[PDB]
Short mmCIF file of C-alpha atoms in Angstrom, two decimals:
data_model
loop_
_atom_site.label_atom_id
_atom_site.label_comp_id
_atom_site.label_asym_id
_atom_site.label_seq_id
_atom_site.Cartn_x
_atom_site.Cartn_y
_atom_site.Cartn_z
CA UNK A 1 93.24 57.66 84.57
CA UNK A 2 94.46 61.01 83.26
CA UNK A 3 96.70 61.87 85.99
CA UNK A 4 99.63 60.08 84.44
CA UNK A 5 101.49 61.71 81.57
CA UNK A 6 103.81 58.94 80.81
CA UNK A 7 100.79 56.72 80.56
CA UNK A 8 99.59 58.79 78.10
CA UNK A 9 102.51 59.69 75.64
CA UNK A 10 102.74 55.97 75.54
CA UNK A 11 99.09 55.15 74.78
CA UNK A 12 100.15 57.67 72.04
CA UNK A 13 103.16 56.72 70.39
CA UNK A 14 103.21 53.10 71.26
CA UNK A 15 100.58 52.40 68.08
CA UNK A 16 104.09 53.72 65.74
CA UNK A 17 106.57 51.80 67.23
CA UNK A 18 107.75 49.14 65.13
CA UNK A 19 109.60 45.51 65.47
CA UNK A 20 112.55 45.02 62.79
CA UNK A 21 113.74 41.43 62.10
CA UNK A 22 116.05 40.30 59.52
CA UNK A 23 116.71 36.55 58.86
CA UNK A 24 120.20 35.69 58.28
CA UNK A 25 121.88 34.46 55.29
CA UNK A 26 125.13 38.65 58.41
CA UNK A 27 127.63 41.49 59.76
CA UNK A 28 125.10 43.37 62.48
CA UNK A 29 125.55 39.98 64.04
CA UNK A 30 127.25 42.27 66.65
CA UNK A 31 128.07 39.36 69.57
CA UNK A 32 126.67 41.33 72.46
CA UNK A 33 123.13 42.15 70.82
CA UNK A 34 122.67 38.58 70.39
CA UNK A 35 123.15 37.51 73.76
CA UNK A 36 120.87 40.41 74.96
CA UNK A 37 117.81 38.70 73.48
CA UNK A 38 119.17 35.21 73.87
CA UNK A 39 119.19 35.65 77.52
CA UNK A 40 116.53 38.02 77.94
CA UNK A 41 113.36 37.18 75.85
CA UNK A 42 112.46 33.54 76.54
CA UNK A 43 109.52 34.73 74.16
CA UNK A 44 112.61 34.11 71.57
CA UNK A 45 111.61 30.96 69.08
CA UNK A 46 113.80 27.77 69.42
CA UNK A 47 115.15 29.03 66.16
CA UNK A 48 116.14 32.54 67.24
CA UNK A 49 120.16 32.16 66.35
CA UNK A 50 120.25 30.42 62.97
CA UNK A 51 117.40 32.21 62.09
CA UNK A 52 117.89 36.07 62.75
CA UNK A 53 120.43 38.49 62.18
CA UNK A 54 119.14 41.27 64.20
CA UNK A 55 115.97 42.25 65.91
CA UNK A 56 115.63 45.80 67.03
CA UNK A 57 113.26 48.62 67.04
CA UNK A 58 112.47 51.74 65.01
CA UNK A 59 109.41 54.43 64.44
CA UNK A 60 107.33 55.77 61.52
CA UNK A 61 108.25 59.51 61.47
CA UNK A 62 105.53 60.20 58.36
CA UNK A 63 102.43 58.84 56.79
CA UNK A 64 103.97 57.30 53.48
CA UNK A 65 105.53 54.55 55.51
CA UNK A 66 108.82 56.07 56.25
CA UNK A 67 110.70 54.84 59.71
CA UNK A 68 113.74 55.55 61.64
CA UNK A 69 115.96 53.24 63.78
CA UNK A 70 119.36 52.39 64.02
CA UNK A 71 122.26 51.36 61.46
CA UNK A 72 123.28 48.41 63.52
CA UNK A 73 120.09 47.30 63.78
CA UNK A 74 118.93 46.92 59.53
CA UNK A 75 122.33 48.13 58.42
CA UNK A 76 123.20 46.74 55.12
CA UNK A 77 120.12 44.42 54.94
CA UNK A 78 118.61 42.90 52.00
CA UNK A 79 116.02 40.58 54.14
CA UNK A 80 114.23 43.59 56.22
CA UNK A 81 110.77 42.86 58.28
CA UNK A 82 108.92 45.40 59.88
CA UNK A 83 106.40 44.22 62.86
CA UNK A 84 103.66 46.22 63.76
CA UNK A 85 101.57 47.07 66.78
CA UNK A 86 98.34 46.10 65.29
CA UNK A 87 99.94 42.98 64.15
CA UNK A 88 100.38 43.15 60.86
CA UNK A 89 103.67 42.84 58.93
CA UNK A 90 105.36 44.48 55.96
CA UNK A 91 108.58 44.34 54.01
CA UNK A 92 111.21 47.50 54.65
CA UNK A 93 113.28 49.18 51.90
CA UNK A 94 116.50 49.81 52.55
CA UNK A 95 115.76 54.28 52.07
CA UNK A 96 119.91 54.97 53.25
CA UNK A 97 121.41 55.03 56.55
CA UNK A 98 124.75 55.84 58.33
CA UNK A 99 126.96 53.86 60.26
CA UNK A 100 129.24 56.89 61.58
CA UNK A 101 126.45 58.41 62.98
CA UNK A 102 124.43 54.73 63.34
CA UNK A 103 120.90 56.16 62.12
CA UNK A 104 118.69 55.00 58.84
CA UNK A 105 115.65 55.40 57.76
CA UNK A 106 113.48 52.73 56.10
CA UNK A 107 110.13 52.26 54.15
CA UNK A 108 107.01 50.40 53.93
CA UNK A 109 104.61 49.97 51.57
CA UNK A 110 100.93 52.06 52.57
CA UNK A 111 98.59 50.44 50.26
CA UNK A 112 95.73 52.36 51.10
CA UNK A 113 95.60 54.07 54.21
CA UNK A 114 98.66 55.46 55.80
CA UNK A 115 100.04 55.18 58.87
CA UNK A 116 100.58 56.62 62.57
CA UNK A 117 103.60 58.56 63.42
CA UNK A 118 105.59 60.71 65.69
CA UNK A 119 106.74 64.26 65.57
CA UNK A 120 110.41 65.37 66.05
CA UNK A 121 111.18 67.83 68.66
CA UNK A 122 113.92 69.67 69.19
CA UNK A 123 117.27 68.62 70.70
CA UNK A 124 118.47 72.29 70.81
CA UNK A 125 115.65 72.99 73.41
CA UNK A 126 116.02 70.14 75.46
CA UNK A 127 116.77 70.28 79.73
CA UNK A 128 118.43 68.21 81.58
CA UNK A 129 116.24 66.76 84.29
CA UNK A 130 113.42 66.57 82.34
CA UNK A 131 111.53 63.16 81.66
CA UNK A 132 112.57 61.32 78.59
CA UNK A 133 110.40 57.92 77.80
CA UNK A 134 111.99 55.38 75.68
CA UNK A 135 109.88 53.36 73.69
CA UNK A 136 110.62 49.78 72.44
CA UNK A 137 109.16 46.99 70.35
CA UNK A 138 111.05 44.09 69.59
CA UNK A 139 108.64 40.89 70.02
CA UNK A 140 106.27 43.29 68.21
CA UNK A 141 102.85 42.33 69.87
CA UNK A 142 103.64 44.81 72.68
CA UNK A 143 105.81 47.90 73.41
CA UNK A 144 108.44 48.08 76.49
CA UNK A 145 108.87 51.18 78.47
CA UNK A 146 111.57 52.68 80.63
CA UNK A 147 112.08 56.04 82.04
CA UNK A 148 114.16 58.54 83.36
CA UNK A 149 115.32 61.79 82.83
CA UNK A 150 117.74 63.66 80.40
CA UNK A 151 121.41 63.54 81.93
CA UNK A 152 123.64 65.52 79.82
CA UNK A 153 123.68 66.37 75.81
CA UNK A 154 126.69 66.13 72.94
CA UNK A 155 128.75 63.31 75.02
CA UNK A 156 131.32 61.16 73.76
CA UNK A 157 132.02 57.63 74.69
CA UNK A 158 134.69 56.09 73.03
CA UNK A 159 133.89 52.95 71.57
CA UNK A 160 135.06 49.91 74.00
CA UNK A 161 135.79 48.49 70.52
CA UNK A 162 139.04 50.36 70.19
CA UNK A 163 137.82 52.04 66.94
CA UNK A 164 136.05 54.89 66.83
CA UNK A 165 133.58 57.24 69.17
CA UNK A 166 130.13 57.55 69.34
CA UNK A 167 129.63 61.12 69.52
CA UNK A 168 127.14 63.77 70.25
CA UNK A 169 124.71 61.45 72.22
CA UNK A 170 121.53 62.21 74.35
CA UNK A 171 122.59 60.43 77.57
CA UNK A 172 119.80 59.54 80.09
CA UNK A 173 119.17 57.12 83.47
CA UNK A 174 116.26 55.33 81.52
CA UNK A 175 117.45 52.14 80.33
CA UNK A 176 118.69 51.94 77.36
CA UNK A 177 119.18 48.28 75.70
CA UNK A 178 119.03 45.88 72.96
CA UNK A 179 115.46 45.28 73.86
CA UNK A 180 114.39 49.44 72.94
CA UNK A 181 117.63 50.29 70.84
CA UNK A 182 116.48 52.03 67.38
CA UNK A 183 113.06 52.70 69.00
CA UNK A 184 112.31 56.17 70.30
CA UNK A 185 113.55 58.71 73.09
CA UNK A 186 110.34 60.69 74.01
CA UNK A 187 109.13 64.38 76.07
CA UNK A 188 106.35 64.74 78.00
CA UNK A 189 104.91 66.30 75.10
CA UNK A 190 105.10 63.24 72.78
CA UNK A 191 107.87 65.04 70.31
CA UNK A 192 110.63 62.40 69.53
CA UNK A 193 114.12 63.96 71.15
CA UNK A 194 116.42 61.27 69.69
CA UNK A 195 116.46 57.48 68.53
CA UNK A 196 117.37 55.10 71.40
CA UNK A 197 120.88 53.46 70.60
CA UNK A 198 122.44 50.70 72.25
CA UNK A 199 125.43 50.64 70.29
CA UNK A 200 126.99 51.74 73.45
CA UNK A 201 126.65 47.70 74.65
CA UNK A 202 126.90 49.23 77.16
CA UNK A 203 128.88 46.17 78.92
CA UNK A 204 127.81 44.93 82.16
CA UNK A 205 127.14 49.08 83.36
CA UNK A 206 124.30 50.76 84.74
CA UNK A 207 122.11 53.84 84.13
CA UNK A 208 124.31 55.01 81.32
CA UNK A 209 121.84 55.31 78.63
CA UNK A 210 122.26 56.95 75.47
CA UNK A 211 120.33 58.60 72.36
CA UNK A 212 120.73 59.99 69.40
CA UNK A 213 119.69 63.82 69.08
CA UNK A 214 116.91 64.22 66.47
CA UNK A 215 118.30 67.38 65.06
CA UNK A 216 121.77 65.44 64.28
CA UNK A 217 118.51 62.98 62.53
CA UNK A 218 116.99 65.88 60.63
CA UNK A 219 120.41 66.84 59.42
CA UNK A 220 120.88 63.40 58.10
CA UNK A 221 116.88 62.61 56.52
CA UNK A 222 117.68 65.61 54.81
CA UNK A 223 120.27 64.27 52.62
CA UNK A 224 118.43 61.71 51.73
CA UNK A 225 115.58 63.98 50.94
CA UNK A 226 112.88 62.92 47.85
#
């Protein structure tokens, strides 16, 4: 009833996490985020392939509309749709982003009333072995939730691609997947501690989950400041 924490950030920040579908017609068609879905989420239309180029997850972070998720998810989208919680659906402007880093921001139109959102916390103050509650959304309708605990800040993976690193990531044993990528990395206080990025496939592995730090986000929204 009251009791459970977890239960209750989610009842919390569940309302702000957001679906993010973009119909093809096509480079974030990243082969192993396809077959995630695909072979995951029979609640997939018959059309799924043809139809979409990626389906992730992201968050409002303020009022006016303005959300967060990852690069590979929208990337460089024209088509963007934004799911919501309640149900209702909006259209997503492409605000900037950053594929190094894999983080953009995107916006949606607030008509009249504006929306829910969460807070950012701060990565700097973070412990390891304390709870972090990632929050997903990608059918839209209803929010999926794993947890864990923080493993270990600023890692480095190098990129089974043979091209790069993905650096300075939030690393936890909650899973981390297609299915809650771009959605967010939560405390037991409710402040976002990083944006949930599957980038990092991770490739038939287990409990390696990763995250991007919000203060590395900060640093970036900044630049792309009103």
């Amino acid at each position: 009833d009251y009791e459970s924490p977890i239960v209750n950030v989610v009842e919390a920040c569940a309302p702000a996490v957001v679906k993010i579908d973009v119909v093809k017609t096509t480079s974030f068609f990243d082969p192993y985020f396809e077959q995630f879905f695909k072979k995951w989420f029979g609640e997939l239309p018959p059309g799924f392939e043809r139809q979409v180029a990626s389906l992730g997850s992201g968050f409002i972070f303020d009022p006016e509309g303005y959300i967060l998720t990852n690069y590979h998810v929208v990337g460089g989208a024209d088509n963007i749709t934004v799911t919501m919680l309640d149900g209702s659906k909006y259209d997503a402007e492409y605000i900037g982003g950053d594929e190094e880093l894999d983080i953009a921001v995107i916006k949606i139109k607030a008509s009249d009333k504006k929306f829910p959102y969460l807070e950012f916390g701060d990565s700097d103050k973070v412990k390891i072995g304390e709870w972090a509650i990632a929050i997903g959304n990608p059918l839209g309708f209803q929010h999926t939730v794993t947890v864990g605990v923080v493993s270990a800040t600023n890692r480095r993976i190098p990129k089974p691609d043979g091209s790069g690193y993905y650096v300075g990531l939030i690393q936890t044993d909650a899973a981390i997947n297609p299915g809650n990528s771009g959605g967010p990395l939560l405390n037991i206080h409710g402040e976002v501690i990083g944006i949930n990025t599957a980038i990092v496939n991770p490739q038939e592995a287990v409990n390696l989950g990763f995250a991007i730090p919000i203060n590395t986000v900060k640093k970036f929204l900044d630049t792309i400041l009103t």
